[PDB]
């Protein structure tokens, strides 16, 4: 008959919105969020939302920006108690190196000495220490790298850099939606959606050109990008298998220290015991060979058949983006990935045991590529061994060719937000709106 306005409250309707999510962790000193975080839900509840086709868009996901800002802020807070090395910027005369040497790139290791300050304002002390070539620039007389651009802070020796899984949880009135659909490319409608109070834990792993210790694709290698036609964009590749990599530093370095001023001390590399050798990483050849074949097959689906796919090392740019960054034992390594990407594919096999890559060590680093800031890592005593799994790749189109039967890819990197996206693409945040109206016929007495 006559339809009337009715009011309902508690109606299950939501709208897209951004809100701050709060971190939680199962985790004693560490640079990571564990100090800011609260205890986790050990078994987060998941409720499937049936008959829901909610759209996801990882490229517009603001959770990425929140994660990035929190990680940087935490990194900085961990350094505020730590020792400043301003007195360290000195003449640094160097005398080459003497030992039982199998060496490295020639001149990679340097023996240097200087006048360092002491506990009393009235006195100075003569010291010597070893430096890597990357740490020192010639003015013989030398200058510590970046003394002419920034202050250098020593990382605290007692604080771990080991990744800690971080969970993110919604505030009341908000919910986190998760896409369960297999082989999702990160955009468009998701066929299967569920609601969780919190995300699965995400580790703050930092690496370049290759993604380490991330999640694996459930069935097949997944290739995604913001704009497949734009050569500028990075292409993220998620593997459905791990590839194990064995990295080591054989040199048996020793550690010595000097008290500087009343409140602080400086740590430096001492004499090296035994033969001096190049740092390196071992990747299984058979495993890598299979892995590339899986990636190539998926590339062909996107770029079509009848294409010759070639891989190559980066053509240029700084060490920070042209090599693979690691953090193992607190030492920072830069490894040359050439030989992993050195191939051409035609017949679903290459046209042509293990692969060993050379690595370099640098003590002066800038993790977020910020201008005017730098950190000095302390030396780690003894031999380092580190084994990890490669879980994905960052590739860019180099040739971009449409005028030929060929295409060439090279490793990408330098933008950390793309690492965060490899885990966060699954999630979306929405706001709950409980109020609504309907026509149902009814009346109310006055």
């Amino acid at each position, epitope marked *: 008959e006559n339809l009337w306005v009715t009011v309902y409250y508690g109606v299950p309707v939501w709208k897209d919105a951004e809100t701050t999510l709060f971190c939680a962790s199962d985790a004693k000193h560490n640079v990571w969020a564990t100090h800011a975080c609260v205890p986790t839900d050990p078994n987060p509840q998941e409720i499937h939302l049936e008959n829901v086709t909610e759209e996801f868009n990882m490229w517009k996901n603001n959770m990425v920006e929140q994660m990035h800002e929190d990680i940087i802020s935490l990194w900085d807070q961990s350094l505020k108690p730590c020792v400043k090395l301003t007195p360290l910027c000195v003449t640094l005369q160097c005398t080459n190196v003497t030992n039982n040497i199998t060496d490295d790139m020639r001149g990679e290791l340097k023996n240097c000495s200087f006048n360092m300050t002491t506990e009393l304002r009235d006195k100075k002390q003569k010291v010597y220490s070893l430096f890597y070539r990357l740490d020192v620039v010639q003015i013989k007389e030398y200058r510590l790298i970046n003394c002419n651009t920034s202050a250098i802070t020593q990382a605290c020796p007692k604080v771990s850099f080991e990744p800690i899984p971080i969970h993110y949880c919604a505030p009341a009135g908000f919910a986190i939606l998760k896409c369960k659909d297999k082989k999702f490319n990160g955009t468009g409608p998701c066929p299967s959606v569920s609601t969780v109070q919190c995300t699965h834990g995400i580790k703050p792993v930092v690496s370049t050109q290759l993604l380490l210790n991330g999640s694996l694709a459930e069935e097949e290698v997944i290739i995604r990008s913001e704009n497949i036609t734009n050569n500028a964009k990075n292409i993220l590749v998620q593997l459905n298998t791990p590839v194990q990599i064995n990295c080591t530093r054989p040199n048996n370095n020793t550690v010595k220290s000097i008290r500087i001023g009343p409140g602080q001390a400086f740590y430096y590399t001492g004499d090296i015991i035994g033969d001096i050798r190049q740092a390196h990483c071992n990747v299984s050849k058979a495993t890598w060979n299979e892995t590339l074949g899986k990636v190539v097959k998926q590339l062909r689906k996107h770029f079509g*058949n009848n294409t010759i796919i070639r891989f190559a090392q980066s053509s240029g740019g700084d060490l920070e983006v042209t090599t693979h960054s690691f953090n193992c034992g607190g030492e920072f390594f830069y490894c040359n990935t050439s030989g992993l990407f050195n191939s051409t594919w035609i017949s679903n096999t290459s046209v042509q045991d293990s692969i060993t890559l050379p690595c370099r060590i640098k003590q002066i680093i800038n993790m977020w590529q910020r201008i005017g800031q730098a950190m000095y890592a302390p030396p780690i005593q003894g031999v380092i061994r580190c084994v990890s799994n490669i879980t994905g790749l960052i590739l860019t189109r180099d040739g971009g060719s449409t005028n030929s039967t060929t295409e060439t890819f090279r490793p990408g990197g330098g933008d950390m937000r793309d690492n965060w996206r490899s885990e966060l693409y699954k999630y979306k945040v929405v706001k709950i709106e409980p109020l609504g109206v309907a026509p149902t016929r009814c009346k109310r007495r006055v």
Partner: antibody
Amino acid sequence: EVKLEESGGGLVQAGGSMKLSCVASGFSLSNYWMNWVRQSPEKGLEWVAEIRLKPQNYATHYAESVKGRFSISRDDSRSTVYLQMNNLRAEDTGIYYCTRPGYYGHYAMDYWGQGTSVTVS
Amino acid sequence: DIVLTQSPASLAVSPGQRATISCRPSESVDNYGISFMNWFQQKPGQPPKLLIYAASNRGSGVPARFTGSGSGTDFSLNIHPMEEDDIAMYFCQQSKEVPYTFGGGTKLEIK
């Protein structure tokens, strides 16, 4: 079993226009490159057009002998390929074929449709 | 454009004898150490069929009697034994560059 079916052929007055079509079957069109060729006993085989996939921004290429009078386009949602032509010349008379590049890195016309006659006068 | 020369215009071959057809690209088909010449067979009323790819690899369903040969700018097709079933036009193709080009369409017949 891959099949290609041509249609839209027939006699057209010179200076006129027509559209040829090819229906893909047995394979995913969106995952594959497509090509057109033509034949006449006077000339033998001649390549006329190629069309690329989305990452390639659907770029197209033409033989100089047909460029600017011919256009190639595809509809991935209907599994079809079209060859549009205008400003037709008697020189364009021949048998047109829908083709597929086949073997990888060894581009070759592994599959052909039956083709269709086109006559211009 | 790359010019693909093919000869003879035609040849008659007696049954059981070897046929030979040659092609001379103005620029080599070779790339990545691999030849890019294709060979096709055609009979009246039918579309061309691929016999050889990469100037040496027989296609699916192709009998042993057909073989490719050569490198650089000098390639040839050798058919043996010749049979009536092999009567056809034969074409070379250069797949290395756009535009793709075709050969002379040499006629092979029984003598």
